[PDB]
Amino acid sequence: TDRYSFSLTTFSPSGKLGQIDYALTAVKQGVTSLGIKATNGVVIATEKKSSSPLAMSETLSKVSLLTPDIGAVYSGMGPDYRVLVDKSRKVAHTSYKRIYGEYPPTKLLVSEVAKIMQEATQSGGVRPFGVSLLIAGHDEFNGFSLYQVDPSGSYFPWKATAIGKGSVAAKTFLEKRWNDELELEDAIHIALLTLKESVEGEFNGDTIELAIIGDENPDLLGYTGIPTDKGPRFRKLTSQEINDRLEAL
Amino acid sequence: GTGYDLSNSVFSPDGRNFQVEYAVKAVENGTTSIGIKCNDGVVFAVEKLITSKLLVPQKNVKIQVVDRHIGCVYSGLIPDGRHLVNRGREEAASFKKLYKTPIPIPAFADRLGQYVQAHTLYNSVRPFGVSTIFGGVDKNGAHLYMLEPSGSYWGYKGAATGKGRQSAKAELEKLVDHHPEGLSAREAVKQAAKIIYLAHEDNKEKDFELEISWCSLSETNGLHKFVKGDLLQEAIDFAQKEIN
Amino acid sequence: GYDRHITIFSPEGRLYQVEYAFKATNQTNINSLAVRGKDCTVVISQKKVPDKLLDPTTVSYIFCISRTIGMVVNGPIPDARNAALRAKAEAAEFRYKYGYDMPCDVLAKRMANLSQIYTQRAYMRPLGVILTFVSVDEELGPSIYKTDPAGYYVGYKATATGPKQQEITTNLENHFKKSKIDHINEESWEKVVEFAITHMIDALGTEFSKNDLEVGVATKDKFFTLSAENIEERLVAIAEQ
Amino acid sequence: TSIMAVTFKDGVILGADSRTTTGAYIANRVTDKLTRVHDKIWCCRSGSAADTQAIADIVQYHLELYTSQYGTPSTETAASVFKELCYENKDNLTAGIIVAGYDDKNKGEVYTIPLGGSVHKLPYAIAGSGSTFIYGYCDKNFRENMSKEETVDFIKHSLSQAIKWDGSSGGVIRMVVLTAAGVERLIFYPDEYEQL
Amino acid sequence: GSRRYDSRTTIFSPEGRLYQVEYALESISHAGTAIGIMASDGIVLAAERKVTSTLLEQDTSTEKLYKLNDKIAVAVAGLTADAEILINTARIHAQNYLKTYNEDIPVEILVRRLSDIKQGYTQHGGLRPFGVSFIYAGYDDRYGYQLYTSNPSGNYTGWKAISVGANTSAAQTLLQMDYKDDMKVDDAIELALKTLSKTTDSSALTYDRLEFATIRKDGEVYQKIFKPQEIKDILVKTGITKK
Amino acid sequence: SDPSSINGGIVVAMTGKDCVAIACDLRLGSQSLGVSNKFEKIFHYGHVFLGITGLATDVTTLNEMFRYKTNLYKLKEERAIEPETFTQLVSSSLYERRFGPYFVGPVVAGINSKSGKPFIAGFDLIGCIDEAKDFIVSGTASDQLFGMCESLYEPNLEPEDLFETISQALLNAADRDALSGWGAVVYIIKKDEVVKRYLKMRQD
Amino acid sequence: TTIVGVKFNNGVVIAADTRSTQGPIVADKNCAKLHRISPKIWCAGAGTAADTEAVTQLIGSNIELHSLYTSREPRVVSALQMLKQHLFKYQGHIGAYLIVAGVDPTGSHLFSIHAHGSTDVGYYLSLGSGSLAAMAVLESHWKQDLTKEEAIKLASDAIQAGIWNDLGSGSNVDVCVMEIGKDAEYLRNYLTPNVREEKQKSYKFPRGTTAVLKESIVNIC
Amino acid sequence: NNYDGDTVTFSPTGRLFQVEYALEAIKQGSVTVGLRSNTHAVLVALKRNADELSSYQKKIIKCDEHMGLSLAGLAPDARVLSNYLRQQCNYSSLVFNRKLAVERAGHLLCDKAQKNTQSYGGRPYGVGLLIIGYDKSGAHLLEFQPSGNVTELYGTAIGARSQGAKTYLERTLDTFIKIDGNPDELIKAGVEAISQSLRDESLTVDNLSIAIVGKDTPFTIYDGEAVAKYI
Numbered sequence A: 001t002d003r004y005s006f007s008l009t010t011f012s013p014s015g016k017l018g019q020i021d022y023a024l025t026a027v028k029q030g031v032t033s034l035g036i037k038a039t040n041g042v043v044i045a046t047e048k049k050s051s052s053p054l055a056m057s058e059t060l061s062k063v064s065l066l067t068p069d070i071g072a073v074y075s076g077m078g079p080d081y082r083v084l085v086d087k088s089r090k091v092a093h094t095s096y097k098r099i100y101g102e103y104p105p106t107k108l109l110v111s112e113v114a115k116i117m118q119e120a121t122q123s124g125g126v127r128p129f130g131v132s133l134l135i136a137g138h139d140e141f142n143g144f145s146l147y148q149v150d151p152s153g154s155y156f157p158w159k160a161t162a163i164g165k166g167s168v169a170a171k172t173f174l175e176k177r178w179n180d181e182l183e184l185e186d187a188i189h190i191a192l193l194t195l196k197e198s199v200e201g202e203f204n205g206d207t208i209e210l211a212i213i214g215d216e217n218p219d220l221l222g223y224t225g226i227p228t229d230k231g232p233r234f235r236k237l238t239s240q241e242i243n244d245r246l247e248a249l
Numbered sequence B: 001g002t003g004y005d006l007s008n009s010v011f012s013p014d015g016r017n018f019q020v021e022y023a024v025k026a027v028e029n030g031t032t033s034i035g036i037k038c039n040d041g042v043v044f045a046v047e048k049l050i051t052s053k054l055l056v057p058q059k060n061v062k063i064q065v066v067d068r069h070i071g072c073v074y075s076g077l078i079p080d081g082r083h084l085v086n087r088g089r090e091e092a093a094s095f096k097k098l099y100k101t102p103i104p105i106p107a108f109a110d111r112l113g114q115y116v117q118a119h120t121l122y123n124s125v126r127p128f129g130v131s132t133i134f135g136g137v138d139k140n141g142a143h144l145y146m147l148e149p150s151g152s153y154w155g156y157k158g159a160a161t162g163k164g165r166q167s168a169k170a171e172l173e174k175l176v177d178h179h180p181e182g183l184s185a186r187e188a189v190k191q192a193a194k195i196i197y198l199a200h201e202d203n204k205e206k207d208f209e210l211e212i213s214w215c216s217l218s219e220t221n222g223l224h225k226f227v228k229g230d231l232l233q234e235a236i237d238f239a240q241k242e243i244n
Numbered sequence C: 001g002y003d004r005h006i007t008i009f010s011p012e013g014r015l016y017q018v019e020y021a022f023k024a025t026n027q028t029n030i031n032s033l034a035v036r037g038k039d040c041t042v043v044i045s046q047k048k049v050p051d052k053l054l055d056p057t058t059v060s061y062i063f064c065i066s067r068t069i070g071m072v073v074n075g076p077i078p079d080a081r082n083a084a085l086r087a088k089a090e091a092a093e094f095r096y097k098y099g100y101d102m103p104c105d106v107l108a109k110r111m112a113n114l115s116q117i118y119t120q121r122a123y124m125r126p127l128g129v130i131l132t133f134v135s136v137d138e139e140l141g142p143s144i145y146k147t148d149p150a151g152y153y154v155g156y157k158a159t160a161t162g163p164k165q166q167e168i169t170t171n172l173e174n175h176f177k178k179s180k181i182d183h184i185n186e187e188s189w190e191k192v193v194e195f196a197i198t199h200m201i202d203a204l205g206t207e208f209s210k211n212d213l214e215v216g217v218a219t220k221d222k223f224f225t226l227s228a229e230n231i232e233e234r235l236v237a238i239a240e241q
Numbered sequence D: 001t002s003i004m005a006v007t008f009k010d011g012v013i014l015g016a017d018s019r020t021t022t023g024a025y026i027a028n029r030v031t032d033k034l035t036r037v038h039d040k041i042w043c044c045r046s047g048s049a050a051d052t053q054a055i056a057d058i059v060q061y062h063l064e065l066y067t068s069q070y071g072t073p074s075t076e077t078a079a080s081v082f083k084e085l086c087y088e089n090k091d092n093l094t095a096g097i098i099v100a101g102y103d104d105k106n107k108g109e110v111y112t113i114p115l116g117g118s119v120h121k122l123p124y125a126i127a128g129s130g131s132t133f134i135y136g137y138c139d140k141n142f143r144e145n146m147s148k149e150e151t152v153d154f155i156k157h158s159l160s161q162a163i164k165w166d167g168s169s170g171g172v173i174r175m176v177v178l179t180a181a182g183v184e185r186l187i188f189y190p191d192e193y194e195q196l
Numbered sequence E: 001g002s003r004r005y006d007s008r009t010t011i012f013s014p015e016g017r018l019y020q021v022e023y024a025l026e027s028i029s030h031a032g033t034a035i036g037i038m039a040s041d042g043i044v045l046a047a048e049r050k051v052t053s054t055l056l057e058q059d060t061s062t063e064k065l066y067k068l069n070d071k072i073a074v075a076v077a078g079l080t081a082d083a084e085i086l087i088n089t090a091r092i093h094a095q096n097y098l099k100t101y102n103e104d105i106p107v108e109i110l111v112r113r114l115s116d117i118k119q120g121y122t123q124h125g126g127l128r129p130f131g132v133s134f135i136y137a138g139y140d141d142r143y144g145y146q147l148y149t150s151n152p153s154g155n156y157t158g159w160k161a162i163s164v165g166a167n168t169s170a171a172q173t174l175l176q177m178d179y180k181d182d183m184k185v186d187d188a189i190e191l192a193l194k195t196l197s198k199t200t201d202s203s204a205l206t207y208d209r210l211e212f213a214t215i216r217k218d219g220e221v222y223q224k225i226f227k228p229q230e231i232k233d234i235l236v237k238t239g240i241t242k243k
Numbered sequence F: 001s002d003p004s005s006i007n008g009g010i011v012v013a014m015t016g017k018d019c020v021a022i023a024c025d026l027r028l029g030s031q032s033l034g035v036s037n038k039f040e041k042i043f044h045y046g047h048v049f050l051g052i053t054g055l056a057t058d059v060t061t062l063n064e065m066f067r068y069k070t071n072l073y074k075l076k077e078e079r080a081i082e083p084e085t086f087t088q089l090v091s092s093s094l095y096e097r098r099f100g101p102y103f104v105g106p107v108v109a110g111i112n113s114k115s116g117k118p119f120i121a122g123f124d125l126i127g128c129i130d131e132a133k134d135f136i137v138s139g140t141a142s143d144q145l146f147g148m149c150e151s152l153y154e155p156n157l158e159p160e161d162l163f164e165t166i167s168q169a170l171l172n173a174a175d176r177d178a179l180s181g182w183g184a185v186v187y188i189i190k191k192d193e194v195v196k197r198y199l200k201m202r203q204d
Numbered sequence G: 001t002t003i004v005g006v007k008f009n010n011g012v013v014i015a016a017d018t019r020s021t022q023g024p025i026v027a028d029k030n031c032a033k034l035h036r037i038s039p040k041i042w043c044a045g046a047g048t049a050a051d052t053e054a055v056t057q058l059i060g061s062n063i064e065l066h067s068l069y070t071s072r073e074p075r076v077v078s079a080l081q082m083l084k085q086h087l088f089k090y091q092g093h094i095g096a097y098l099i100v101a102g103v104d105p106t107g108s109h110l111f112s113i114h115a116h117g118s119t120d121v122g123y124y125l126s127l128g129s130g131s132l133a134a135m136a137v138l139e140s141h142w143k144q145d146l147t148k149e150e151a152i153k154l155a156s157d158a159i160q161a162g163i164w165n166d167l168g169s170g171s172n173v174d175v176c177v178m179e180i181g182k183d184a185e186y187l188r189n190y191l192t193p194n195v196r197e198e199k200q201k202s203y204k205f206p207r208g209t210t211a212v213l214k215e216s217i218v219n220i221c
Numbered sequence H: 001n002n003y004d005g006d007t008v009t010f011s012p013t014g015r016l017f018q019v020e021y022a023l024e025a026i027k028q029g030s031v032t033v034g035l036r037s038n039t040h041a042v043l044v045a046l047k048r049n050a051d052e053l054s055s056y057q058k059k060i061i062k063c064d065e066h067m068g069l070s071l072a073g074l075a076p077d078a079r080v081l082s083n084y085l086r087q088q089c090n091y092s093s094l095v096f097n098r099k100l101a102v103e104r105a106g107h108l109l110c111d112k113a114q115k116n117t118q119s120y121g122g123r124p125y126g127v128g129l130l131i132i133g134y135d136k137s138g139a140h141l142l143e144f145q146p147s148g149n150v151t152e153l154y155g156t157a158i159g160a161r162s163q164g165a166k167t168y169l170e171r172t173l174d175t176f177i178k179i180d181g182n183p184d185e186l187i188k189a190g191v192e193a194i195s196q197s198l199r200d201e202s203l204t205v206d207n208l209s210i211a212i213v214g215k216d217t218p219f220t221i222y223d224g225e226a227v228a229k230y231i
């Protein structure tokens, strides 16, 4: 039977929620992942740290599509992120698309995943999630947006940020390299330059994962005949495109 | 740190579940019980410690039957063995109801194993304090299995558990080494009587009562029957001659 | 203190119960490896029968999950059979609900999601097993996907699991760096079984008899396990190599 | 519908028509009423198409799980699963099933599950709306341990008569031969059996 | 079983204190300062953002001030996620009241419902309380303009001016010094900005570090959440920054 | 008897050049007995208008439900709901009660604030979206409204003419229905202006 | 309704009419009855229009989630099984009669699903009230190995037969072609055989014709 | 000792300390003896009193016309167990028109008691039961312990100082086993046995309870003056 019907995350006398701080610690030991918002798109990048060279990297995809216009990356415990992306994809349909016929705005999906994480920090017999997420999305009435969601369920909108090991250094770089006149290609370039410091090993299309929320891709739609159906804005960059943009640094 | 052995389903730093090992300690303190798979069946035997002569002889049966073809004996906490046998009877009943055929011995073994192993996944329950030797005859022949408090079960040419499990095992191995072609049903019955008498030496202070059952394709037509009457006395006499 | 007994976070952001389950995976002292061929996937495992009273045919750590998916488990046999029964149930339910055979990687993801649940909910302990699923998927070809107590899962060009895991891993890495391909360029599954046995004998440094091995082969629309006689045929054919 | 299953020396043969009707309208004239629930365990379905499809799908799931756990199931076991589904849900089902299987121990086996969820093991079974017109013929012509050719001819003649008299039966005649050699699919077209 | 791991979040201390309530109040004490001021013709809410960076977007940011309906808003101090849970429940309760009575929910009724929700966690369930304190600014026809506060204990109080979060003692002393009953809403804006500038921990008080809202009066009540540009304008207008 | 025919009433929407029009009768009765001369069946949430005909209690219940839902929508999204999104919302809400339906016939009308396109839509009692760019009719006199609209309508009408068209349609349809009439209201809706007019019609 | 589906050599086409009726009254003159379950899995619906739209949207949402979970192109047999089991659960009370076609990694597929949950396979299928007319056309013209153009012509002709001869069908012809390897082609109003002729009069009224009792501005701000 | 917190904790030795403490709760209970022949079965019960103004607590409970029990330990748990046994006998009589065999009743009690030794929350029953019954197999006497172990005996005793009566019956076995068809002599043997377990007391009319079941004798309880002839 399930006798754990009590909170496993309580306030310490200092006021800290110990499990939330320890989950944030677990996030801090995660592989560096960053996001940069431009004026014509958002970019999210991370390193594809593979344990064994026998493991196929393509199956270990750290960037995940949530809606055709909203994608996600993480830093922390992979499996928590996987079950979180599954829950997020489901809630995008159950709580919105099946109600309004359109996919949810980025902020609303972010708040839904934040609600899931907050439940994880207060429900009975459960630990918080050991991940921090970067959600990059586009909706018609808010444009492009980039949000960060923490194990506590707190989420904040960033012009650009990073999470993981190189978080502080990467964020300093971004602070001194970002401007409100930035372009999607310039943002991809800055993301590559910021990852180059947080990746000590080989740095090619095979070892990094990069995706964008840019313009609509009708070729990625799969069907033609609906002028209102523009296409998906989320596009994961292939290893070849990453290499082509790396050779010109 | 410490306290890893206080709760069930808790991994120790070396990857062990100490509550299961304490259950095994509880098993080892039980009476001896053996099973011998022969050419066309299986035989089960158990020592019943006659604590006093106020016990009604031939009563207080330990060998239990599941369906009409499965025999189960256990060493350890007798009530936990009865609980496990009740669960196995429910499993066999549901299997017969759905698939018509009586439950095969490996299928029944996996039912019991999943049940026992599930009893090692939560701190709200205690692992089973029994080890169980069971088996019988299905469409694929004779099968003998032994199942541990951990939920681990395996198929055995011969099995033994309890206090005199060591001696018994040795004796069993001698059988396997002396005639690899196999024993007949009645030969296995007499040999099980011998092995129980030999393994009783670890409990020689108190008197004991032998109890034997068997499930043979030729001698019992695939059904599980207690070895009683003239055959039981014959096995007892064979044991008396083998000890002296 | 108690943060070492249930699946909650230690101050260092660690789940000690998951690590101790990983430790428990090596309790059986059995190594196994999996390799991909041109159109097949082979899994070899060590077969250690310590007791003379044991029926060797019932001593197994390879499971026939579906008609196309095989699963080899590194860990205690109770948790192994638990995970194997769960995987068989999930595969059957998948075929029923979606009308096509469950893909290897999807079953791996399912078991990995359950493992993640065990590491996040405190009432259930993690399973001390590492599950290696092999198949010949209709869309991916020969596939090897591994799941661990942490809820992590990943596909492999080849893999190995057990105490001597790293040695076999190194041997395979070296062979694939030399061969420059990610599989075994052999047409028959017998030759791939031979290759796997050869490289395990080379990496472990021990010979194998027919009663020391367990071989599972996955081909298009079939997964089977070799008998002692088929393994003996493979070993005899190895003798000429 | 008109369905049957006949045991013979080498195994079993299932036969069916191909007509699915919504009243006097033929909704489908190429219907496959022979459904595989296991490698050498098939069934002929009659009655509600939706009900028979759902029952066959659930039986196939149960037999797949049964095979994954305990090995290849006997034909009697498939009949038992069909029987449990049809009897425990007799109030909401309109399904008459003929389960035919082959194994090496029992050669061919035929079970029939009519309305109400009873099961009957028979040397051959006929079912469906058209089977009513061939009871006397099949009883007078069936023999034990026929050859494959004589069994195909027996099924062909019986089903041709049933199609001739039953307006709810028609189309092509489908057959599935279950033997140790495996599974064989046979089809016979109207221009072939209408002149029989 | 599991009883060894149960921290028992809903028990009493030997002094008659709720451990978790006290610890959550201590947690909130480190949250960004929020101030509410009730003038005779309006209400003002101001709050300082604890999270600050050059790279944090402010246009799309809502961390401290939230709309409950069209006549009631909240200033938050503490765990933002618990705050959003409670805010969603409060919005639902307000809309329930509207559907049932075809009238906007009176401010005290909504505050009391949210406080009962908070208190429930401190008496049963064995769960941790919500680490959030609220300042409710609302208007209804019965009582006019209303200002309330609610802490994790489930207790709620009504104020003319009040502060929650960091430096509540200093802010309360300053408000008690400079508050007059007959003042207008603009003077209250000035006083709130002055208190936030005098009790801030940063060097200077900028538009990027604070959120602002006004519930004022056309015969109707308008609820305005101040934009970054409006915040910058009101800051240079009250003499806290230049240009 | 029939829940959609107990209270009576009609709603009709039309599209013109950069405008919509939505009109309803004013009668609420219980079969032959007429009770209320002031029962308007058109409501608006922000800038999206919804007319509801059928069972009066269900009309009121749906109005309150959609007010609830659109207020929560505006609180969560910080913007008013659009007519197409609101149409999908009405469809999903109606189908949620598929086997215990509301006996209503909703009509959505409005100008999309971001695209400026006029938009009207209609549903049945279980929420089947009827996307028509010209006109949508609903109520007891749905057949009369169908005839009047199919005859009188021409596309791209200025508001002053679309008003006359929709008003004549509503009036002449209501005159041939026993359970409709007793007054009428017409909303002419442009992007930045909405005019509401009470028509003079027969009071029988 | 009149919906048909025809398999050709390299894919499958589905087609439908655009008429929606409430009894004898034409409710919608251009209803879109071709619903997209997935980019390459489409299906035409007949019966209770709300039920068809709802069941297709639900199964498409679940299929999208399933494809995200499994990282594979969705399979037509998956949509088929989901629809059949959902319809069977409701014993025909969800009056949806669908023709589901598409292409997936396993090839091109065409099935029909009836409201009670029964599914059928064929090279050409028809459903709706005009199904008997369209099916007449199909039985008269279908042949093995059709080209894309031959199949589009056959499907459009079947829909036209249903339009002219069945009172429940009319207006235009919607088509969706799905070839193996190509994107799905959704031809909305592929044909428009019925277009209302020009009216004899403009019925525009002179402003001031309608008597107004009271006028007021509405605040939507 | 950290292993006696509940019944779901095995000690390193393999022991269940809560079960042992329930057994110790029995050992603190008053003495009761049971014995049987081939035609009859007798329970004798020395019911304890709280003081001289107290009532000697009811110690023998009837379960059916052919079966009953006496208790030693926590009277409430014996009430629960006896009610369960009554319901099982009643179920047998109603559904099968069949008197429940005493062995089956012992098995049912064993399972009911075992259910409490493996689940968190709740405790084992703190009672020991002596169950007599005459069924199709003759006379039967069973000893039941909280551990779940139920054993069929010719005679036994449970409670404080029960070893005296135990050894008495061990010596008198061949004597009382042959008291067939003379209930008074069997009751006298049982009373002598229960007398062997007295230290500073002597059986009187108030503190004696007898129960008899047999071939042509339904389960009957004698209290008060009815037992005076056996003192």
Ligand SMILES: CCCC(=O)N[C@@H](CO)C(=O)N[C@@H](CC(C)C)C(=O)C(CO)CO
Residues within 6 Å of the ligand: D001, D002, D019, D020, D021, D022, D027, D031, D033, D045, D046, D047, D048, D049, D050, D052, D128, D129, D130, D168, D169, G114, G118
């Ligand atoms: C489109 C769904 C309409 C439907 O379900 N029709 C049923 C009921 O007539 C039907 O076609 N039954 C066939 C069985 C086949 C389908 C397996 C049958 O058994 C005979 C008479 O028994 C009639 O051909």
Ligand SMILES: CCCC(=O)N[C@@H](CO)C(=O)N[C@@H](CC(C)C)C(=O)C(CO)CO
Residues within 6 Å of the ligand: F124, F128, G001, G002, G019, G020, G021, G022, G023, G027, G031, G033, G045, G046, G047, G048, G049, G050, G052, G128, G129, G130, G168, G169
């Ligand atoms: C909207 C009014 C309420 C409604 O549900 N009408 C139904 C049937 O009255 C309807 O329009 N059915 C069409 C199917 C399409 C619209 C998906 C159809 O199938 C043929 C006959 O089968 C009729 O044209």
Ligand SMILES: [Mg+2]
Residues within 6 Å of the ligand: C006, C007, C118, C119, C120, C121, C122, C123, C124, C125, C126
């Ligand atoms: Mg756990």
Ligand SMILES: [Mg+2]
Residues within 6 Å of the ligand: D163, D164, D165, D166, D167, D168, D169, D170
């Ligand atoms: Mg015919």
Ligand SMILES: [Mg+2]
Residues within 6 Å of the ligand: F174, F175, F176, F177, F178, F179, F180, F181, F182, F204
């Ligand atoms: Mg009228």
Ligand SMILES: [Mg+2]
Residues within 6 Å of the ligand: F203, F204
């Ligand atoms: Mg009138």
Ligand SMILES: [Mg+2]
Residues within 6 Å of the ligand: G162, G163, G164, G165, G166, G167, G168, G169, G170
């Ligand atoms: Mg027509």
